[PDB]
């Protein structure tokens, strides 16, 4: 259940302010080589941060 | 005894070489410092959760 937000084009390899289905932060989005299982929505680091 | 002394010395150095190559725990005093600091940082970072 999400509010009436408009989506924007996805931008990679640049510093952006992002919001992914409620997940927010600042960073650089790159293509990943991680093997997410079909049910996994996000991942976390050793530090247990997204 | 110069020849003997040189041989005993050279042999003792070889023993150090082998002892270090074999025993992983020999440098525990330095590894412990590294481990204490690594734990301190991991603890600090985990507190953000």
């Amino acid at each position: 259940v999400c509010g009436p937000k408009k989506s924007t084009n996805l931008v990679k390899n640049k510093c952006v302010n992002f919001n992914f289905n409620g997940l927010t932060g600042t960073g650089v989005l790159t293509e990943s080589n991680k093997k997410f299982l079909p049910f996994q929505q996000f991942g976390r680091d050793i530090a247990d941060t997204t | 005894n110069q020849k003997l002394i040189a041989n005993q010395f050279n042999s003792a150095i070889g023993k150090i070489q082998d002892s270090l190559s074999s025993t992983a725990s020999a440098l525990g005093k330095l590894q412990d410092v590294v481990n204490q600091n690594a734990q301190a940082l991991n603890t600090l970072v985990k507190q953000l959760s």
Partner: peptide, 27 residues
């Protein structure tokens, strides 16, 4: 070399945790 061979950072760094290099390098 034996001493050196015998004796994560991104995850830590990303929280404002940097590591400064020694003034005197191993060399």
């Amino acid at each position: 070399d034996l001493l050196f061979n015998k004796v994560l950072i991104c995850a830590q760094k990303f929280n404002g945790l940097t590591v400064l290099p020694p003034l005197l390098t191993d060399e």
